[PDB]
Design a protein around this ligand. Structure first.
Ligand code: 3N2
Ligand code: 3N2
Lengths: 343, 343
């Protein structure tokens, strides 16, 4: 509930973010047509998500900063940096939906799939990335942590980018080579491609804004956060198949998309000669008959029970981790975030 | 000749740049496969050009910095930042060749056109962009101008990105709307898409490294450089058609690519009802017969003579500009660069 009480002032600040960004054409009417395009890009790709990453920046801010140092301006910056995280998010989404040729995202049609856009979406994505640094300059230009944020964001893009390469190398479009879907590879892909920018970035950003720039502190927070990120992804894979669209709010397709899901990774470590063959002969197909056939092989391997088990162990681990590395940070920082992920 | 005497130590430093970038997997063997991909990306897209933008950083450095302050380390940084400019260049090229669906570049096949790559080139381009900031950190992390360079590069991407949008809005793929190919639009497209990162960036970078961070000085250098950039583009358009492949080293295709060239912009400001119709009925076609037909309409309008004229006026203007805003910078900085562009 710590988030719901913040989501309003957050999603509402979005309107200002836009105004600010699309108001440099005021002094340069020449590039006006481009700025109008930028606004359309932002209003379509940065809106429509759950804003968890963005909100985490704000929620963490209030918890790390003293109630009196949270003046109108300090909250204004936290919202802006919260939206920069969402912009980084938007940047990756637009680009990723093009590479894997997705059809929809957040319920609507993918930006590049929109008539008239197409590959020009590549430039749009690059722009969303740029606005990040334009905002950090417009608001935190003079703050003592200005350079900290810039580097954090830049590094988060590099991490995510590297993770993206890894994933493209692992499950090529048209290569059901289940031989590379190993254990370590799955954890490396999740670490760089998701864990870092989804969990470390948001909190690390709120830290630097609170003055907590200690390499040790960030090192500790990262250890907890990356572990959370890893669980989140595994619970994402599980729910993708054995989940319930009514609750999840989306139907799974990892099996059909030949994804290096956590499920298939466990299926491969627990498969007999003939079983592997069955998978190697159904993982990827679009036919629901061949897909459900795979789900059956998973259930038969009691993977869902394996998850339930791993989940219990994970919960303990994270708690053990929070009790060891949270300090000098308020355990609530991690506890709140964790409770929003687990169960 | 000021460049040729530097191009060697420059293109040779490229080998070290790579080593440095692709050596972080030493402490993280996990993302090794990705780092190997990064190396292939860099060796294919950052090499094979004339390195003018990159060299300009180095050549300008030696001219702005006192001969004694040019120790082994100072030259090491100048080469690195010179290559960052080339990496920014590579980043844009890869992305642009995909958006306009080009077939070749620098003689070879476009990276995305390479079998196995395709749209994954979108991530590759994003990586080339990342290496820029990874290098600035590995070498100028401790320099007093560190933040200056980071912002300069970030801003140069935003400018280039905005210019790119403008160009995509002006000459859409499948819209021979010669109505938007105006005068001001052409200058706005060139200013953001080329002039800024091609001419201002290289010198501005060498300035910040020399301690020249004055907002006024940079403002002056920018005024000269953006004007040079504009001429360069106009001479680029002219030579694209009325040039000579033997000297230019490339055959023009602006007419066929429905490009908002400088030629067509002048052709439209100097066209009678029927003449405009002729153009409006040949500009874009692939048929050499319909293309040469356009060249004829240009020559008939004495545009080549109009260029010769504008060129003489331009040369004077730049000289008048250098004599007014060069100081306190060594006129040779701009003079050398200009002589490499003109005639
Ligand atoms: O929303 C996502 O896709 C992943 C994520 C990152 S921080 C955070 C906080 C709460 C919840 Cl529910 C999810 C997340
Ligand atoms: O090389 C290019 O394409 C444009 C350019 C930027 S700085 C510079 C210096 C010398 C020459 Cl010949 C060209 C250029």
């Amino acid at each position: 509930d710590v988030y719901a009480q913040e989501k309003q002032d957050f999603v509402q600040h979005f309107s200002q973010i836009v105004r600010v960004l699309t108001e440099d054409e005021m002094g340069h009417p020449e590039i006006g047509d481009a700025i109008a395009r930028l606004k359309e890009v932002l209003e379509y790709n940065a809106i429509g998500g759950k804003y968890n990453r963005g909100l985490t920046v704000v929620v963490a801010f209030r918890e790390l900063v003293e109630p009196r140092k949270q003046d109108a301006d300090s909250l204004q910056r936290a919202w802006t940096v919260g939206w920069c995280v969402e912009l980084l998010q938007a940047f990756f989404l637009v680009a990723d939906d093009i590479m894997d040729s997705s059809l929809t995202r957040r319920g609507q049609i993918c930006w590049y799939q929109k008539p008239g856009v197409g590959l020009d979406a590549i430039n749009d994505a690059n722009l969303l990335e740029a606005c990040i640094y334009r905002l950090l300059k417009l608001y935190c230009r003079e703050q003592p942590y200005y350079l900290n944020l810039i580097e954090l964001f830049l590094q988060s893009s590099y991490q995510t980018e590297i993770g993206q390469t890894l994933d493209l190398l692992t499950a090529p479009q048209g290569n059901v080579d289940l031989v590379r879907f190993t254990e370590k590879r799955y954890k490396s892909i999740v670490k760089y491609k998701t864990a870092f920018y989804s969990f470390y970035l948001p909190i690390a950003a709120a830290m630097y804004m609170a003055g907590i720039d200690g390499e040790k502190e960030h090192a500790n927070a990262k250890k907890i956060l990356l572990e959370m990120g890893e669980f989140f992804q595994i619970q994402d894979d599980y729910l993708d198949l054995f989940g319930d669209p009514s609750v999840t709010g989306k139907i799974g397709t990892d099996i059909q998309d030949n994804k290096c899901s956590w499920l298939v990774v466990q299926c491969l470590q627990r498969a007999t000669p003939e079983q592997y063959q069955i998978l190697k002969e159904n993982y990827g197909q679009k036919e629901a008959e061949k897909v459900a056939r795979v789900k059956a092989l998973y259930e038969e391997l009691d993977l869902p029970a394996v998850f339930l088990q791993y989940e219990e162990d994970s919960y303990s681990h994270i708690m053990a981790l929070i009790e060891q590395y949270a300090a000098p940070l308020p355990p609530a920082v991690f506890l709140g975030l964790a409770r929003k992920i687990y169960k």
